[PDB]
Amino acid sequence: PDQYADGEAARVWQLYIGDTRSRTAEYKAWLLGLLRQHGCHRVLDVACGTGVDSIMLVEEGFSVTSVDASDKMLKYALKERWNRRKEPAFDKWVIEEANWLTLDKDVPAGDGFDAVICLGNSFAHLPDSKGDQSEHRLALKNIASMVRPGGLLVIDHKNYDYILSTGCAPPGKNIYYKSDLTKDITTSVLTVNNKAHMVTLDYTVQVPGAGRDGAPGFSKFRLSYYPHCLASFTELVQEAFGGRCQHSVLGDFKPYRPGQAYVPCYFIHVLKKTG
Amino acid sequence: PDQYADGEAARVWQLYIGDTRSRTAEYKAWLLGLLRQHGCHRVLDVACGTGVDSIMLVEEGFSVTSVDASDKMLKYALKERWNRRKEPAFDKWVIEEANWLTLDKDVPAGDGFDAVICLGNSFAHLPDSKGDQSEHRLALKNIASMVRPGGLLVIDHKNYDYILSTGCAPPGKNIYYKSDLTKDITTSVLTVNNKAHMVTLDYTVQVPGAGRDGAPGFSKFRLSYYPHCLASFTELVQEAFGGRCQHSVLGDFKPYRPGQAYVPCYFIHVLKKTG
Amino acid sequence: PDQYADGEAARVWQLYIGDTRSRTAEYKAWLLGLLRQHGCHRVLDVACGTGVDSIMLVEEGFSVTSVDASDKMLKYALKERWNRRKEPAFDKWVIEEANWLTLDKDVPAGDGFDAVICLGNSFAHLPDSKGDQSEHRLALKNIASMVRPGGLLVIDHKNYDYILSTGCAPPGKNIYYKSDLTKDITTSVLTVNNKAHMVTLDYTVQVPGAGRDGAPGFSKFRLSYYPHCLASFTELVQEAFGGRCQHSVLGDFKPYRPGQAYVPCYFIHVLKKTG
Amino acid sequence: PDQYADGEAARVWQLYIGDTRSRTAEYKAWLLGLLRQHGCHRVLDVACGTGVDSIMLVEEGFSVTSVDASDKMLKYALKERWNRRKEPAFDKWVIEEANWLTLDKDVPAGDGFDAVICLGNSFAHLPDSKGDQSEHRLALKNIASMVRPGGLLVIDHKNYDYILSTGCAPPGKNIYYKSDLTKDITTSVLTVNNKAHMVTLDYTVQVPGAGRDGAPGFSKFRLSYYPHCLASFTELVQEAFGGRCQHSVLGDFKPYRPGQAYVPCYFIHVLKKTG
Numbered sequence A, B, C, D: 001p002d003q004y005a006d007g008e009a010a011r012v013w014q015l016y017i018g019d020t021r022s023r024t025a026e027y028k029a030w031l032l033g034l035l036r037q038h039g040c041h042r043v044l045d046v047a048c049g050t051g052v053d054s055i056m057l058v059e060e061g062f063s064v065t066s067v068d069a070s071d072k073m074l075k076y077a078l079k080e081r082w083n084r085r086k087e088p089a090f091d092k093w094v095i096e097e098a099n100w101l102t103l104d105k106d107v108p109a110g111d112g113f114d115a116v117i118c119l120g121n122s123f124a125h126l127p128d129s130k131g132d133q134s135e136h137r138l139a140l141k142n143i144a145s146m147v148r149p150g151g152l153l154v155i156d157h158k159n160y161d162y163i164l165s166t167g168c169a170p171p172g173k174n175i176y177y178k179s180d181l182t183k184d185i186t187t188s189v190l191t192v193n194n195k196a197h198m199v200t201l202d203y204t205v206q207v208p209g210a211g212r213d214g215a216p217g218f219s220k221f222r223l224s225y226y227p228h229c230l231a232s233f234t235e236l237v238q239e240a241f242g243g244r245c246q247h248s249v250l251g252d253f254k255p256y257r258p259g260q261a262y263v264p265c266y267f268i269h270v271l272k273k274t275g
């Protein structure tokens, strides 16, 4: 189900994300570069969310059409495009509901897109409901299909290898989500038959105010992720392109070499479809 | 929550347990031997259940009073009593409801029992719902207070150390549950905040028949236990008697020496009150 | 759904019913008289419940076998039996589980009973979940089939005609339930597609004590019945015996003539199998 | 709670409404007339829903700012304003979330509005949660407060007098909702202590396609209303204006005289606040 249905997460996301100028500060020069370095104007955002990155591309004047499964979150991307409905770029910003699993129809690529982006550890949200990675394969497949030949694919996932290994994630220098308000996170790892199956996080977001000066009282929600490990996604994602693609994985938007000292929080998988 | 409220476990429990014969085959000697060695006549079975173990001691001429929290299970025990209500022993059997959490008031020990047995890995059914082993430490105490000075306490639990170590329990030499009817059992360990909070298994007891020869359709029920580790249980159980006790831990009805090659399926803890 | 699964009704049922004395005070004469008039020795109580009515007949030297679908309730009957298990009559009492919907296989009548009683407005507990009185018409049948040719069937129900008529039931002269402890009972009638589908009432049994003298805190439970109207029940019940029966309907343990000024609180239906 | 939370009703509303050109055909000339006959340009729509009527007013060039409690429905109003964002009238169409109960703040009228509209039997959606019509009074009150002195108020409610009396509504010539797809409606009336309290309708909407040519398979949802009777709303609504207002009720947008032959589906209450 849409873990964002109760729109409580989407309610504090602005806060949950933390500083946008800062969150976006990291990797903004690299994405905009890579996207331009391959000369892509047509960009589809499959995890638009509230639209933090889409808006960025809109502003940097690309042709972005963004989709997302939760209208609760989308609802906000929408508000922005409206407030900025006078800005020509934004008058052309596209926002539609869509689901990776049924994307094939949800968003007719036909021509395809110059680049496809699925940032902020979204895909990890898709669960292994069937036991087999069937769905994951399908989802990934449909995304790969949105990229025009020679197009790109920028998808990532938190470093679950480190999180699973030390049973705890590496917080601090977390590029996508840093807020002085996240007062609590209770991690819950459920492994079945010795296979990590679900990682459930119970959040506590400190909403400014909460009554008198500096007083407890926050917003709570919970998100569950699949702990995708590098090796597996690497292959899995590649297999999505039918093998006809160029694969490249980064640490936290820096070159990543297996067995390296630095432990990245996320793993940015960049893909170039050749067929 | 009462794992037996739906009454799926009890209805086929008889099969789940298997041949009481082979069930009792083993330690009916051991058990009978340990209570007698300490001259235990008045026994209290805080985990009566279907009544298996309680019935025996009864049949073996003991003064037994058995209590359980689940009437669905207790009722079958009761059932047996009525059937054999002409036999003086049985007419002398006491079957009643009680809950470890409130044992102190449910079953008025006053003087105490010669030996209180909690066999069957019944304790591991008690969750740590509070988060801190408060309830456990509590239940274990109340029980302990039913044991008279010098008396005994025989409480066991599966070997969750190995289970938790390998993510998979060892199915073999199950002295308490052995059948040809178990068709589906899968392991799901759930650990929160880096601590194993619970172990879930899905049970499928193929009840004789299920249609013509060669037809599916058996009873379905799954259970969830608390992976109690040796060390913690050892500590946990002895504090129940406030340190005034003689602790003894056995492998599979055999002494247990740490590091010993043998992998015990269960762990039988034997205590002797001294205060 | 089993209205007694939570076991709130039974726990205080004793109080809900009131003084069995006054309870039985009335129709213990009536009942005792009707069965004897037809020389009914072997009786089956398909609504045993706590065992109130069943116990009496037993105490009144009858050959009674009682069944009920709710063990929570049956257990208390059972309890009684064990307590008085030395009295030949009781040791001869049969208490078992059964469900009208499947009575035919639950209780093997074979020969049949002299008289089958279903007093207490127990039937109105059976909802029309299907939409069509399919289940009712069914349950009523299975019951009927437990009655031997010439035997009897005494099944009753509250006067839902008046209830449904005035939206409010008449609280007075309750031969089955009279107490000073009932603190809250509100009427909610639900009719779908222009037909009264259900009547719901909220029960509050003020259990003695609830703290010091003058302190709230009683048990809380509410029930829902099927407003069975006279006509339909008359029709419904007779068809159960396939027209081959002698129907008789009484007011409040008194004959009932349509239009009669008196408002019966209950309706006792008396049938005599002739086929 | 927002009965439109599962947005399934909002999903088929387009179909549920039926033909808009037709639905709007009735009463379009009358509303546009009365709104102009009193020269109102500033109109607030408190039950915007998908915005069927707001859009109308927008198109007919009025100054409409529409609010509604369910963002699921609002979501669609929004989509339209965007598609027609190039249309000057529409570029100024206002859509915000708001709840009658807390309207006072949700929408600052201050100046107030020339006219307020609450059509399509929306208000009936507000339940009597407190037993007293408290909430109803508050809600209504807040709405009355949105109307500028001399402003108007057009609120309606289905004819529950006829529905309640014949336990069945008068379908056919239903102005607001007529679709050749509504394959099923199961009415459920719940009266408590002889007072109609809730009318629950379980809908079945035939969504074109459903597989092969003409094949079953529809969308289902359920709405619950309060059965407001003419007399009561008349007074209730008037009292909302503090008595300082002009009251007028129509049948189906035609003069309505008590005890009249023609039985209306809806009762259009038109109000003129004078103070």
Ligand SMILES: C[S@@+](CC[C@H](N)C(=O)[O-])C[C@H]1O[C@@H](n2cnc3c(N)ncnc32)[C@H](O)[C@@H]1O
Residues within 6 Å of the ligand: A004, A017, A046, A047, A048, A049, A050, A051, A052, A067, A068, A069, A070, A073, A098, A099, A100, A101, A119, A120, A121, A122, A123, A125, A126, A176
């Ligand atoms: C963590 S949020 C993204 C936040 C945003 N990317 C950012 O960086 O702030 C994950 C998003 O994944 C989307 N999502 C999850 N499963 C999806 C699916 N199957 N199809 C489409 N979107 C999905 C959700 O609706 C949610 O907005």
Ligand SMILES: C[S@@+](CC[C@H](N)C(=O)[O-])C[C@H]1O[C@@H](n2cnc3c(N)ncnc32)[C@H](O)[C@@H]1O
Residues within 6 Å of the ligand: B017, B046, B047, B048, B049, B050, B051, B052, B053, B067, B068, B069, B070, B073, B098, B099, B100, B101, B119, B120, B121, B122, B123, B125, B126, B139, B176
């Ligand atoms: C595995 S069963 C026992 C089976 C039985 N030992 C045998 O060998 O057939 C565990 C029992 O623990 C009991 N139990 C669990 N929590 C309890 C509690 N708090 N108080 C009393 N009994 C409890 C249940 O009612 C259940 O019958």
Ligand SMILES: C[S@@+](CC[C@H](N)C(=O)[O-])C[C@H]1O[C@@H](n2cnc3c(N)ncnc32)[C@H](O)[C@@H]1O
Residues within 6 Å of the ligand: C017, C046, C047, C048, C049, C050, C051, C052, C053, C067, C068, C069, C070, C073, C098, C099, C100, C101, C119, C120, C121, C122, C123, C125, C126, C139, C176
């Ligand atoms: C009001 S109680 C009877 C109380 C009892 N007559 C007395 O006077 O105390 C109704 C009984 O109907 C029984 N009952 C309801 N549906 C049943 C069914 N389908 N089969 C058997 N018993 C059923 C319940 O278990 C419940 O005990």
Ligand SMILES: C[S@@+](CC[C@H](N)C(=O)[O-])C[C@H]1O[C@@H](n2cnc3c(N)ncnc32)[C@H](O)[C@@H]1O
Residues within 6 Å of the ligand: D004, D017, D046, D047, D048, D049, D050, D051, D052, D053, D067, D068, D069, D070, D073, D098, D099, D100, D101, D119, D120, D121, D122, D123, D125, D126, D176
């Ligand atoms: C039947 S729909 C309206 C359809 C639309 N008026 C038409 O004619 O097609 C009723 C609307 O009332 C709204 N509603 C219900 N209770 C509300 C409240 N307390 N405040 C604001 N809107 C409310 C819902 O969100 C829903 O859109």
